[PDB]
Amino acid sequence: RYTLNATAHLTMPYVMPGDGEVVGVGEPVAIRFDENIADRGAAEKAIKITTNPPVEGAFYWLNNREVRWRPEHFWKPGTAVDVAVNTYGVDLGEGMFGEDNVQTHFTIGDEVIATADDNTKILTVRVNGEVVKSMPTSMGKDSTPTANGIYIVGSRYKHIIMDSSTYGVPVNSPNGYRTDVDWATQISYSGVFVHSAPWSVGAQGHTNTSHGCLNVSPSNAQWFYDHVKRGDIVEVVNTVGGTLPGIDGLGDWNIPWDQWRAGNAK
User: Fold this and answer.
1) Other beta carbons within 10 Å of 5
2) Which stretches within the chain are classed as H helix?
3) Residues ≥6 apart with Cβ < 8 Å to 142
4) How far is CA 208 from CA 108, 201, 203, 247, in A?
5) 105 is catalytic
6) Cα 155–156–162 angle (5° rounding)?
7) Active-site residue identified among 9, 159, 195, 227
């Protein structure tokens, strides 16, 4: 027990969520190393997770330095999770060892699930199974459509600039953009946000005009930004698009329990 808490040569682990955070029902526990991990099974073995009420869960790797852990279903509101990353000096393979141990405790807030349905072009926000907000929306147009699936709410911004080059699409090109936006809530690592779009209010509710983001009105975007937290859920249904890769970053729930469970330790 020479521990360090997770605030929100060798390899350091970094665990999300951070100590004390309150997170939405889809927040997976995340352990991310600063080095690639030859011996996944080892790293998994060194990570103890307790939950109360107890719930079964399992590890799946998003890449070679990041493991994730989650239940089969969304968390039940109330659950406390404690994470013990007992990795100090542990054999992680090919001459790499855990630099230290790491701890975190977190808790699960309300069930918040927002469904965007391309049939109606409404994004309906549900807190504990009840409709508290209904927002006309406008998504990827057919030629750059919004992927179907379940997205985990990641970070939030009062203002930023989305630049398509970040995703290997030049600004000068036909799907290019470098756009200033307010009240931006990120929901995929591939660049999908729910955000203020005063330029598509006319279209919100009628027609997809965006590059992929869920355009909503300025006050609904602000509302989304005020009431939403990491781990809350946006589900997108019925678009002409594909499915959001399970290994996106915020795609976890699109892998099915069974593929997930089986893990990918090797």
Assistant:
1) 12
2) 40-45, 218-227, 259-262
3) 208, 240
4) 34, 11, 7, 26
5) no
6) 95
7) 195
94 carries a ligand binding annotation: yes
Is 130 annotated as a binding-site member?
no
Q: Return the H-helix or E-strand segment holding 193.
A: strand 193-196
Structure tokens at 202: 């006319």
Token pair belonging to 244: 């959001």
Domain of 120, CATH number, reads: 2.40.440.10
Q: CA quadruple 232, 237, 241, 244: dihedral positive or negative?
A: positive
Residue 84 belongs to domain spanning: 1-109+252-266
Q: 34 among the known binding-site residues?
A: no
Catalytic residue from among 73, 211, 213, 227:
213
56 is in an annotated binding site: no
The structure tokens 């809530």 sit at 185
Active site residue 227: no
Neighbours of 95 (CB within 10 A): 8
Enter the tokens of residue 11.
């390899």
- Looking at the structure, tell me whether residues 246 and 192 fall in a common domain: yes
* Overall resolution, Å: 2.8
